[PDB]
Amino acid sequence: LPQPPSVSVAPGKTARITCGSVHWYQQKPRQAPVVVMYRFSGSNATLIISAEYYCQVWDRSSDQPVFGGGTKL
Amino acid sequence: DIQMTQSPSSLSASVGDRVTITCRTSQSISTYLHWYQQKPGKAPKLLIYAASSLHRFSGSGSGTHFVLTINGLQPEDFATYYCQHTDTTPLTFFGGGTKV
Amino acid sequence: NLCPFGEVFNATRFASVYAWNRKRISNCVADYSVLYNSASFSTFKCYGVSPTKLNDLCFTNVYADSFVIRGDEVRQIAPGQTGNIADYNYKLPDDFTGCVIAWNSNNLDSKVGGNYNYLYRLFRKSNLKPFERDISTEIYQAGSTPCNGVKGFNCYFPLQSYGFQPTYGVGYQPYRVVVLSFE
Amino acid sequence: YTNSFTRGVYYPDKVFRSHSTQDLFLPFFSNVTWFHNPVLPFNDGVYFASTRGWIFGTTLDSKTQSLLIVNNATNVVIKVCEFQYSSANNCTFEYVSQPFLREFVFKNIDGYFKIYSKSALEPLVDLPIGINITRFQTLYYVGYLQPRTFLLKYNENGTITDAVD
Amino acid sequence: VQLVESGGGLVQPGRSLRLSCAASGFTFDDYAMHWVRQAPGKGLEWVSGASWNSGTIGYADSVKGRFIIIRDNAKNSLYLQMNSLRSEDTASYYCAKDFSRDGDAFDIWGQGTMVTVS
Amino acid sequence: VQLVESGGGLVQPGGSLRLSCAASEFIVSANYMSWVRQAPGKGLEWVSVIYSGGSTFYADSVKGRFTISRDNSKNTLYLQMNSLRVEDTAVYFCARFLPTYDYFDYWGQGTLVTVS
């Protein structure tokens, strides 16, 4: 599954990430990736924001999670 | 009870010929028919298992029709060839056996 | 309340036979009538507890051992029987009270190209104690020579895949099994 | 410490309306232990009173099953797991309902664990725990029940009013 | 809630290895479990995963016929008996757990070992 | 691997005769083992099998007469042929049945157990 290579943002701005339900995840430099959604919000999608971010769309055609390596904010 | 059938039997001694042996089985065994080559005076030799995978011979087939093929016949293979299959109720059934 | 038989029998996936699931059921009224009155269950037979009087006896606890076996292998899920399954995967005691159902599950389980989700134990130096499962997965040394955990000739991996195909016959098609037990 | 009382009467384990009963009771002017959290024995029953939970069991280890009662601000939880609690495994009963001078009587007979709370302690709830119980700890006054005959005066609407040793 | 892994360590290629995942903060036999691995320098990947009191929805794409997940609700544990290892298997193996009983998004992750094949 | 079976002879009908397969490199306490008899002029016929756990099975024509067993101490496999008949005169191979795709990997050599 895709997602943009990598993004960036100045503090206090709005950060937009496209996962090309999607259950977005977030992993801090060297840690156990933790969930954010199943300031952050998911309009279907994007985890709008006002570390490494990945999605988990459970394909029901193959019946197995397909996390598409997301992006680094 | 499975009932096997090896046709034909006592083939023609034709060196350097594609030799074909079939094994019609009364019921659908998926890939559980194994081919043994019992030379006269010896014990069988397990040419094939799963009806496809060797152990020049090339076997194929599933369900009801299984074939044992000797693409290049050598004067050293004029032997007797048997099928096999084991029922889930533990029972192996050997085929009639075909010469060459 | 009611015991959660709907979760068990109508589940989406069942455990493979060698690592069979075990569900403890207690503190509920169990309605076996819906189980007894089903046209799908191509197997329902049991021992010391008549199917009619199921709704008459209360037990301290009830188990629901679920797994998936080959269709032709169901006859070994019975007290005192022997075979691959009974000897090495799931052994039932001779005094077994509780009972067994099995219904064909070809559409749910068998998919083209082989369903490698289901495995069974193949070798074992000793028959299982009843109602006892083993998960040991060391390369089974079937010869005298050592091989040090490296799979090869005379050392066979003790687990084999059923490899269900939709084109198989009813003998080799998957049968989901549930083995209820009582106190 | 030590103290004496006149109370400890509950409905005699039977839910009839109406008498003399030979049941497990608390002697009227008996020695009760004023406390200010040791592991006290259970004997055959205990009288508990205080002006937020209990842990019961035999060894209070993972070797044996142990009863555990906790009272939230909204809910009471009763579980019987093999508590260590640093560990909790292999448990078969969980009860969830509204939380429980506050005085209690606990008895564990025939695999049932019966509770009475508030004299005339009304039956709170009985639980099919089905484990042995010998020693206990409070998560107060503690007395011990005795198998003696009682006489109970019902008051035209149940409500045991007076009692006679 | 917590999840703890083990078994990770240097393994020669072509050799077996068995992972573990013990859980204590919840009813084990109500939530599915998984094995999510992350190759260094790469994002997340899915290896396998069991179900609540059930079996293996797993062996994602490259671990078919090699890895064997085993779920033992009795001991509140999850096992991944890795077999026939290769160079690409060198990765941290986070355990996981999802909301659903059969399969859905993951919520709670173990720290994961650092299985290395070299 | 040199499975060698021995013990053949001539026994009057209804007698009792012992067959012994002596495995060379295999260990019979672990492998599945089997006896396969080939009547003179006919094809192979199955006789018995012993699983790794000790479970045994027998063909219909030999149930109640033969008993297969093995001894781990000397790594040998036994077939207690009892109640012999005219049609048991054959050659008995001790195979090495493999629980997999279910086939007889390696075979013995042949002991002519004859009845007359």
Author numbering:
A (entry chain B): 3 to 22, 30 to 47, 59 to 64, 69 to 74, 82 to 104
B (entry chain L): 1 to 55, 61 to 105
C (entry chain R): 334 to 516
D (entry chain N): 28 to 45, 49 to 66, 81 to 95, 102 to 134, 160 to 175, 189 to 206, 221 to 241, 265 to 290
E (entry chain A): 2 to 119
F (entry chain H): 2 to 117
What does the paper say about this structure?
Like other class 1 VH3-53/VH3-66 recurrent antibodies, BD-813 would promptly occlude ACE2 binding but cannot gain access to the ‘down’ RBD without significant opening of the spike trimer. The epitope of BD-813 mainly consists of RBD residues Thr415, Asp420, Tyr421, Leu455, Phe456, Arg457, Asn460, Tyr473, Ala475, Ser477, Thr478, Phe486, Asn487, Tyr489, and Tyr505. BD-813 does not contact Leu452; and like BD-836, it features an acid residue (Glu26) in its CDRH1 in close proximity to Thr478 that may compensate for the positive charge generated by the T478K mutation. BD-744 occupies the front chest of RBD, and mainly uses its VH domain to target RBD. BD-744 does not interact with Thr478; however, Leu452 is located in the center of BD-744’s epitope and is involved in hydrophobic interaction with several BD-744 residues.
The SARS-CoV-2 spike protein recognizes the host angiotensin-converting enzyme 2 (ACE2) via its receptor-binding domain (RBD) to mediate viral entry into the cells. In addition, B.1.351 and P.1 carry the K417N/E484K and K417T/E484K substitutions, respectively, which drastically alter RBD surface electrostatics and lead to immune escapes. We also solved the cryo-EM structures of two binary complexes: BD-667/S6P(B.1.351) and BD-804/S6P(B.1.351). Together, these cryo-EM structures provide detailed structural information for eight SARS-CoV-2 B.1.351 neutralizing antibodies. Structural analyses suggest that five of them directly antagonize the binding of ACE2, whereas the neutralization mechanisms of the other three do not depend on ACE2 blocking.
